[PDB]
Write a protein that binds this ligand. Structure first.
Ligand SMILES: COc1cccc2c1C(=O)c1c(O)c3c(c(O)c1C2=O)C[C@@](O)(C(=O)CO)C[C@@H]3O[C@H]1C[C@H](N)[C@H](O)[C@H](C)O1
Lengths: 34, 335
């Protein structure tokens, strides 16, 4: 009964599971923002 | 080694946000770290130490030789293709055709960074721009095509890194379940976006009541994974204030598998491009931009200095997976 709703600003951090490096990082404050 | 690239990632992230605190931010810290480490292969004295310290390396722990080996080993694992994941990274140097480079530098650049040397007629600025932009377009498979907008006709060298990432969701979203839904820019401002949804899935999960955020890990198996951090409404700034290697560690360590009733994630595409001069100077990489620059490991003379550092990144999130691309160029003038 747990809901996870990305309907507000959120962060993504993309990693390599072995080297633990960060390939990419994002903050999405507005997914329509051109 | 990895600890350095992460401290640099968060320092850079905060500087990026400071410039425009309500804007989308997308960037590849590894692309920027790799391009600057590549440049440092040619640096000496204070120019060199400022670069490596700015990248957050401790020179008393690791030597210059050991740092470049680390990048070499990492670069070779980021060129992979499978049914789940396409990853590719490249480095290149575009060099004024008549400019004499030291053998040691071009040997090291190819062996450690995979970089070829391309003779380039920068005086024909439009042709040089297209040559570099095509390299980046080819490396990012069409996703980044205008990294270089303006190019000084007196440019001597451009160092370039690109990264391309395409990964399918382990559990894909069904497009039939994507519907327009509110996205709250703040408590009181909201737009409608296509919102993908999944039902009944088991993913690593951590609810950080102390930091007022929920952390989940999608696509967690394999070579790469995506850590999603969802602050409670109006708590993004508080979450950003806690970001660090230590907080990221505790996030990962606190994750536990959990069945999620419903997950909602927007379908969207965003891009950003940056000039990083201001930020790199703030991070202490200063001599490389002045006439005191020492890049004599490139040519055998102190006759080069950095003029511009640009970065572009593009992010695409859709039902089947994600595509991420970024590129960094370091433009170098004569002195
Ligand atoms: C200083 O900590 C970090 C700093 C930056 C990035 C990282 C980490 C980090 O600690 C980390 C991990 O610990 C793990 C991973 C990881 O990518 C990072 C970083 O990127 C990947 C991993 O979760 C998987 O392969 C999925 O099973 C394994 C592991 O997770 C840990 C904790 C999980 N809850 C689970 O117990 C897993 C097996 O080990």
């Amino acid at each position: 009964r747990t809901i996870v709703r990305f309907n507000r600003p959120f962060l993504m951090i993309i990693v390599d599971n072995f080297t633990w490096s960060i390939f990419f990082m994002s903050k999405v404050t507005n997914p329509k923002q051109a | 080694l990895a600890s350095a690239n992460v401290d640099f990632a968060f320092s850079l992230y905060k500087q990026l946000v400071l410039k425009a605190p309500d804007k989308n931010v997308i960037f590849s810290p590894l692309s920027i770290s790799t391009a600057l480490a590549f440049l440092s292969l040619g640096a000496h004295n204070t120019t060199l130490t400022e670069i490596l310290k700015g990248l957050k390396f401790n020179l008393t722990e690791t030597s210059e030789a050991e740092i470049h080996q680390s990048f070499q080993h990492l670069l070779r694992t980021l060129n992979q293709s499978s049914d789940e994941l396409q990853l590719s990274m490249g480095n290149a140097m575009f060099v004024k055709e008549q400019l004499s480079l030291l053998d040691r530098f071009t040997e090291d650049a190819k062996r450690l960074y995979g970089s070829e040397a391309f003779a380039t007629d920068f005086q024909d600025s439009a042709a040089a721009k297209k040559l570099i932009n095509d390299y980046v377009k080819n490396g990012t498979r069409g996703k980044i095509t205008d990294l270089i907008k303006d190019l000084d006709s007196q440019t001597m060298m451009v160092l370039v890194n690109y990264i391309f990432f395409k990964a399918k969701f382990e559990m894909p979203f069904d497009p039939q379940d994507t519907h327009q839904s509110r996205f709250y820019l703040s408590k009181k401002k909201y737009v409608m976006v296509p919102m993908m949804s999944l039902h009944h899935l088991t993913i690593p999960y951590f609810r950080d009541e102390e930091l007022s955020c929920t952390v989940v890990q999608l696509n967690y198996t394999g070579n790469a994974s995506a850590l999603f951090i969802l602050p409670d409404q109006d708590k993004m700034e508080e979450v950003e204030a806690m970001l660090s290697q230590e907080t990221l560690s505790r996030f990962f360590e606190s994750l536990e598998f959990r069945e999620i009733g419903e997950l909602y994630l927007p379908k969207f595409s965003i891009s950003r491009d940056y000039n990083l001069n201001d930020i790199l100077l703030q991070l202490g990489i200063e001599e490389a931009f002045t006439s005191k620059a020492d890049l004599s490991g490139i040519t055998g003379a102190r006759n080069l200095a950095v003029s511009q550092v640009v970065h572009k990144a593009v992010l695409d999130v859709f039902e089947e997976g994600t595509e991420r691309s970024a590129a960094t160029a370091l433009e170098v003038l004569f002195q």
